[PDB]
Design a protein around this ligand. Structure first.
Ligand SMILES: COc1cc(C(C)=O)ccc1O
Ligand SMILES: COc1cc(C(C)=O)ccc1O
Ligand code: NA
Ligand code: NA
Ligand code: NA
Lengths: 403, 401
């Protein structure tokens, strides 16, 4: 029998998970239930909430002690993705089914984007608003809504759950993981403010036959890349947005701890580094951000998040940290850095342009990197075709290397 | 074996269509391929493009010569829906799978919205924008997207098509159309400018246990309601937006011919009429709309569509036509009309407001409707809670009768 990874929190409405798991089993698959609940642990799940938390580096006690709703969701996203790949590496699944509200669907979307293209993936959403919007697109994720007003406002339809179980079971029984052409797996980090070049890079390498995954470097994406680099078969890492490292260095909101970006280097995966988004630290709401980082220029991204302009002194600490990471690398590394700005905020159309910073940064980064890691300073903005073209050419050389 | 209705244009996706059909067959279903192609008519489709066109009342050559995105789409939607329900009438399907771009996905969505809640439904879209947006919400339609750039930009993936076929076959093999309680079926017409009250009406009757289908009355929706009313077990029709009748009278863009709105009445289904959106005729872009409909007032709804303000005389013609239709009714009919405006364009925060029209229109409408059909003039706007509540109360009485 094929195995389906089933993602569903039991702390709310435990009958949804019970019903859907029974419908999967009745349709002829085995179930591995991953339960990322924070409020209560009901039992009956292969991957318990406690296991989920710890896979991400926190005990559930520590997760429950977070006083920040965003950081708490990030911890369970990080844990769920870590636990799912740690499991799949040893016991491969043939499909992923998720049932959740706004937060649970968002967690499932991120997790599903980190599994291979073509693996069956289905989210059953239970919020009245639209489907979740996974980062940079739905990709191959199938979506169904279970909310109906028939028989009562905001009924959660068991007919949808039954249809979803029968669908995923059908897909899983038809799925042949070791089929089709093998596609080298390329992992990329980005923020919205570096998507222009990241999209060009993605499209070029996919055109070559690679499978490219793109992760949002806002607190959980970088850790997803790091987990894949350690536990799955990755051909190339393009760690182009070190937001989570820079925020770690200065107390920003994307802090994901000190080991961000080290895994690929320790595994010896060919890696390209770039300083996308190094023009800002991510602070909180404007009044808090200004209080935490006085005397700077700010851009209010949304009500919760403020881009805080960096300076040369800030980026020398980033350079030092990246150089130390690279000195631990067990495989090849290249570094590319743009001379005319790091993101769309740091641009002629943005609110944080400061052209005095890229030059000194590039010169210092080259001085601290070891001799076997060349730094290429590109006379372009990050989002210029000249910069994506330079990264693409380098990626293609690293992917052409023979065993 | 159960059957799956498979919607896919072969004139642009022939390889994908044959692959996906084969995958459905391998997974143990029979396939009914409905092919709404507009360029070519390739072999193997149960419901050919020619049938899609003619089931709606046009030859495929006539559809091709429209040259016009909206008129072509409306023709193929009307035809695809008529042909699909005609097939299903005698040979019932157990699921619907569609594979298409922007237009094919939208046609599939409209067709799926005219089939019962819970019947397996999956749209695989092939446009880069992602999923299509079915009118007033996805409800029970499942969505996938097959675009990928791997091995070539704007590829569409065999892995996704195979997953989609396996999914719908699995759902169809597990589907029991007789499971659960019967839901009384209620059909409603609307435009975006009457959605505020229609949403309340839908929610109240769904919460009573009804299945409610809602149709956009822009050229294909009304005809879908009429087809269902003629041929299916319908508990109640709320024909609250006679746009397609008004545009037939004046040559507007939602014209769907002379029989719009008659089927439910001729059959005898309990029906409520209202004059939602009677503040405007639908014209084309503003310059052409002014030339077609001179001497009026206009509101540019989007670059393609202009709302052309109606006047007293126009609405007396509409009332005459509605009354003629009602005199043919074989079952209960009631009428509700709002005294403070017919749509969100005809409101204090709308660009077509004319509060001098609803009062005299309501008087005239009552005078030409037969006396056994009540005509209630509500001292509210169409989209006010008082108006939806009046319609809901009458709907409940008519369902209980
Ligand atoms: C959290 O993700 C983002 C934050 C910013 C800021 C804070 O400007 C920009 C782009 C992003 O994708
Ligand atoms: C074609 O559908 C619509 C047209 C209008 C106009 C022409 O104002 C308003 C709402 C609609 O849902
Ligand atoms: Na949940
Ligand atoms: Na549950
Ligand atoms: Na939930």
């Amino acid at each position: 029998k094929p195995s389906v990874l089933f993602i569903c929190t039991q702390d709310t409405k435990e009958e949804e998970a019970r019903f859907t798991r029974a419908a999967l089993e009745a349709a002829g698959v085995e179930v591995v239930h991953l339960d990322p609940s924070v409020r209560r642990s009901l039992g009956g799940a292969e991957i318990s909430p406690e296991m989920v938390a710890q896979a991400g580096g926190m005990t559930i006690e520590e997760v429950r002690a977070l006083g920040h709703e965003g950081k708490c969701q990030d911890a369970m996203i990080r844990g769920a993705i870590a636990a799912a790949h740690e499991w799949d590496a040893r016991h491969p699944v043939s499909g992923i089914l998720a049932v959740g509200g706004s937060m649970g669907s968002a967690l499932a979307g991120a997790l599903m984007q980190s599994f291979p293209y073509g693996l069956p993936k289905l989210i059953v959403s239970t919020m009245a608003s639209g489907f979740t919007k996974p980062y940079m697109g739905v990709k191959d994720i199938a979506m169904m809504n279970a909310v109906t007003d028939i028989s009562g406002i905001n009924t959660i339809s068991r007919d949808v759950f039954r249809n979803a179980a029968n669908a995923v079971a059908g897909m899983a029984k038809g799925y042949d993981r070791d089929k089709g052409p093998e596609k080298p797996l390329v992992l990329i980090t980005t923020l919205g403010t570096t998507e222009t070049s990241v999209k060009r890079i993605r499209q070029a390498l996919e055109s070559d036959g690679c499978e490219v995954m793109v992760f949002h470097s806002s607190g959980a994406g970088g850790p997803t890349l790091d987990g894949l680099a350690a536990d799955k078969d990755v051909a190339l890492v393009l760690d182009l947005s070190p937001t989570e490292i820079l925020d770690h260095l200065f107390g920003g909101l994307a802090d994901a701890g000190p080991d961000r970006g080290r895994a690929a280097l320790r595994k010896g995966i060919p890696t390209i580094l770039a300083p996308g988004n190094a023009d800002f630290i991510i602070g909180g709401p404007i009044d808090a951000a200004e209080a935490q980082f006085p005397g700077r220029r700010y851009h209010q991204h949304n009500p919760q998040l403020t881009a805080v302009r960096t300076n040369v002194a800030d980026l020398r600490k980033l350079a030092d940290h990246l150089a130390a990471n690279v000195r631990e690398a067990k495989g090849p590394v290249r570094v590319f850095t743009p001379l005319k700005g790091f993101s769309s905020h740091d641009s002629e159309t943005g609110h944080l342009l400061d052209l005095s910073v890229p030059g000194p940064f590039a010169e210092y980064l080259a001085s601290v990197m070891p001799g076997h890691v060349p730094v290429t300073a590109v006379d372009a903005h990050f989002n210029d075709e000249a910069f994506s073209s330079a990264v693409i050419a380098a990626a293609r050389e690293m992917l052409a290397a023979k065993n």
